[PDB]
Write a protein that binds this DNA or RNA. Sequence first.
RNA 1: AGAACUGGCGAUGCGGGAUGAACCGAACGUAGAGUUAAGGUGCCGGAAUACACGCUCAUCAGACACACAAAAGGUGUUAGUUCAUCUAGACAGCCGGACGGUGGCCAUGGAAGUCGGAAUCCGCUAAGGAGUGUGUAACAACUCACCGGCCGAAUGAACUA
RNA 2: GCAGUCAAGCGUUAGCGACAUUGCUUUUGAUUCUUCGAUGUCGGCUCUUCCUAUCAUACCGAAGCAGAAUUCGGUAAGCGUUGGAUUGUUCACCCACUAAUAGGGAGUCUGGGUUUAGACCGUCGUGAGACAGGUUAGUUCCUACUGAU
Lengths: 230, 234, 191, 171
Amino acid sequence: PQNDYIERHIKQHGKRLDHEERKRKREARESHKISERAQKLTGWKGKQFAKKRYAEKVSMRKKIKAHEQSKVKDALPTYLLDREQKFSVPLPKVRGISEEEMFKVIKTGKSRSKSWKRMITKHTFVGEGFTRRPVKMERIIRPSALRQKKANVTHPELGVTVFLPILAVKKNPQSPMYTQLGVLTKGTIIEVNVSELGMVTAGGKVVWGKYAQVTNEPDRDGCVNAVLLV
Amino acid sequence: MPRSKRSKLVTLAQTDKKGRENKERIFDEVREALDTYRYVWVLHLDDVRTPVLQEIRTSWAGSKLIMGKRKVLQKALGEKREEEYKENLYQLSKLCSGVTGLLFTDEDVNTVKEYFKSYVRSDYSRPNTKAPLTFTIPEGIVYSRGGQIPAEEDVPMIHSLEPTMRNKFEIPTKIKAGKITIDSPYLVCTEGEKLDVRQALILKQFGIAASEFKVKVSAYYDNDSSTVESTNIN
Amino acid sequence: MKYIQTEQQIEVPEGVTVSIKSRIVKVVGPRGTLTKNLKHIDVTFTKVNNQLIKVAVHNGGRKHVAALRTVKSLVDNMITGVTKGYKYKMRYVYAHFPINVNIVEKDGAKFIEVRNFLGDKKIRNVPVRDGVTIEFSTNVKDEIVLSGNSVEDVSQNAADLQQICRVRNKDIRKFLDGIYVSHKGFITEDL
Amino acid sequence: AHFKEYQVIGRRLPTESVPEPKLFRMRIFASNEVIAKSRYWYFLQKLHKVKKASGEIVSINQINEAHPTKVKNFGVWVRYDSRSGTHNMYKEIRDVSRVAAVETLYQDMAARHRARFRSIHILKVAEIEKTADVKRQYVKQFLTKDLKFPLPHRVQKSTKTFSYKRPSTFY
RNA sequence: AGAACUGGCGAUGCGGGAUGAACCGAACGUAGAGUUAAGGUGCCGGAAUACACGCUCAUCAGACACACAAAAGGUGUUAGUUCAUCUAGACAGCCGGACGGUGGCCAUGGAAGUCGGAAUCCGCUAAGGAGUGUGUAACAACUCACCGGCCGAAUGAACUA
RNA sequence: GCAGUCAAGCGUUAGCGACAUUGCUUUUGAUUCUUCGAUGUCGGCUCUUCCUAUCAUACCGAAGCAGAAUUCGGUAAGCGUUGGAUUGUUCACCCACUAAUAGGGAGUCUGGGUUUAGACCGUCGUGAGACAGGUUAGUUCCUACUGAU
């Protein structure tokens, strides 16, 4: 309660005598305290202090440069202004993911001696036509938690990322049996529904699907990134 | 002494130092003005209000005067016999005790001396001088003018300056509900007393500019006669 | 840069005469006597004139050079206190509870006594340090006066007297009761 | 070390039809003639490429101090590459002789910048004869008129493992 | 991951490295004399608590298979490079000026420079920002950007080891 | 993360790159009623010991902190950190009271279970045989400390 009156009380008692002197002394001692803390604030704290000091120094330098520059002294339509803005693949020779534990073995039966089961620990896209077969036939298991349908897509044009459904996978190198399995396996080329951008090829035939290559590693990240091959 | 040296409190402002270029310009201006006019005068302006100087300049704009560093001006006039721009010009430079304030003009000496003597303006206490008048701060509610006026109409002092009175003016005071007040009247000046910095600041804050500054001149120089007369006015 | 010779000049007025053996310094003047020990500082004094004294350090460093410029300041402060004298004023203001201050003669030490501070029942006592005389600032509403010869003793006494009235767990902006130093100066006024 | 001054010269062994080629002379300080010759070839292979096989030392002569009794100041320019690359450096040292000044400069460089003998290249040494040439306080400090200073905390080594007099600084 | 190539262990004693199957040295019978490699010369530990140029205050420095948490940061130290200030008075310290149209123009109960925002003028000079801050209902009140009165001899800024 | 942007610095000196920076990053406190194949033995009792990356108590500090009371940086391990609950698995959630009911390692009496006991339902096969499940039955003084002669 009692809106900003505290200012009124300060005005009727006026900056307690020692307050101004103590504030000035503390401000003078601020540099010495910072210098002392530069030696204190040991592991897990000195790093943060140094990072903050570096950021402050960079900001001060950039502000001083702006002041110095100021002291010296792509046409767009009238309606777009004042508004926000040799065929090699981008990533050739991708990492050679080997046939290894990624085909994780799950022990079957009460007595774990006849597993025969392989589990894919890599992101995979299937779509509507998954239709899990009877449990007896699960030679290869792609967990549901590791299945993604929408992958991030971008192009070096306007820098706009839009999540779009994954259409299909056409060519996965390094034993394209993975292609047949639908695994992401960064470095693959996959089709994406580009209907959102609405780019139209010559002849008035609007395009709504293009092949894109996965840039990021979905195995080590919870998101899928790709770049349109335009 | 690489580290731990004195730090700086530089602040961004839309102004930069003129450097030696201004000094060279003043040197050239003094050199030109020495021969431009028949009469050269030295005016002491150690402490003078800017508006007063501007008004003086406008009154005789034709009688242009050049100012600058005392040492730089003396060098321009020539401190030694072999450095003087004009014969016996060092005499005027030698008599320049105050801050000049070099005035170049053509009117006779009588006109200049009459103008200097007939002009006087109010000024602050300017410590090291005799007290212009006695003054004591009244008790009770204080006023921005010090109480030596119709205080019934004067606005009471602002609370924001109370810390300044406590620290800067070094006057013991207390803070009351609505207006600044003092338990007893505190004397700050008396007739014939040598004032101090605190008294001068207090008087300036209260606006009691009982003092009166007047232009000071020590001598002048004649281009033709090449003689300096130690004319003085007090 | 390991200066070969560094020293400062100390001006001793004719009203006092110091004697400096191994670094225990006694000062005698019109305002009584004062003493100080400076063996730990490890500096050397030297007399060049009856009114001028010099302190020099040979083959010293910056850490040791800084000691000279503070030894000189301490000597000057002691000389001024023994001749000019140091006076301290500490005004106290209360909002509601009238603060009461009295110099009780308990145990001879003459501890400074404060009562009715913000209504607190506990009694607060601060000892009166040697070489500083406590007196009331008569004609100045709610103010005390401290003076003596040792600047350090008077300053420490004032610091203790103002810290003993600290406020805890309360907003300093709204709470005003306390002891605050008014100004620093000299006994003379007008010497 | 107690280096010596050797005048090392080269000749760029004469090719057919070109007898008596240009002769280059170098002043360098080294502890022995072999080190001086090696440094000569090292500098030659940098200023203008000439290998040991294609060159030879015309003669080597020891240079003694002209006046090894007058105390004088010496201006020395030093270049070294450590830790960073090449960068110039200037120093002023007061010593009786050029060799002593060079030794003191090497010791100071090793102490401060951790520079090595091979990493330090001597550029020029010039004797000073009058004031206003030195531009650093630590050398000007010794040029003061009638300079005097005592030695504090003087101590003396004890020949015996024990002393009964409780030795004290002298004083 | 893979190739050719060199050395030791493999098959191995000996001095040192606290100790390490891969380290440094080193041509393995039984004894004596003297000189060494590697490690050192405060004790365990046989050898200077030797000389000389400097650094190192470290809250567990430093003597650590040299391998990376390693990029900067310290008003911590020692030594160096470049650019300007200069006796036409070096930096820093005490005092005054900091104007006039002006209380700019649009926003409007108040934005007189410091709640909004476009340029930031011309007059004027030793110098003045349609303003750097502290604080005001409204100026007002105080400081510097920049200059001068005293001082009184080298100083300030960026980098390298 | 991807693709840029400004560019303190290094640059073959055309490229890199610290800190910031734009696009993924139901605008009307709406309700997603979403909780998606962890193949492994561990889980819970008591007592002791060690750390602080500390919950209370203790220390002081910054806050539109006027008090009550509240948000948070830091010092501090001295003493405390309780009781019921499921099983149609307890890889965990609920609420009695307190000022709080802090996080771990050094494993060490009890219960699931880790293993051949014997059987059953369904899966798979021409069958022995074993499982995508699952249920029943279960058995695993030597040295060091505390007292004494």
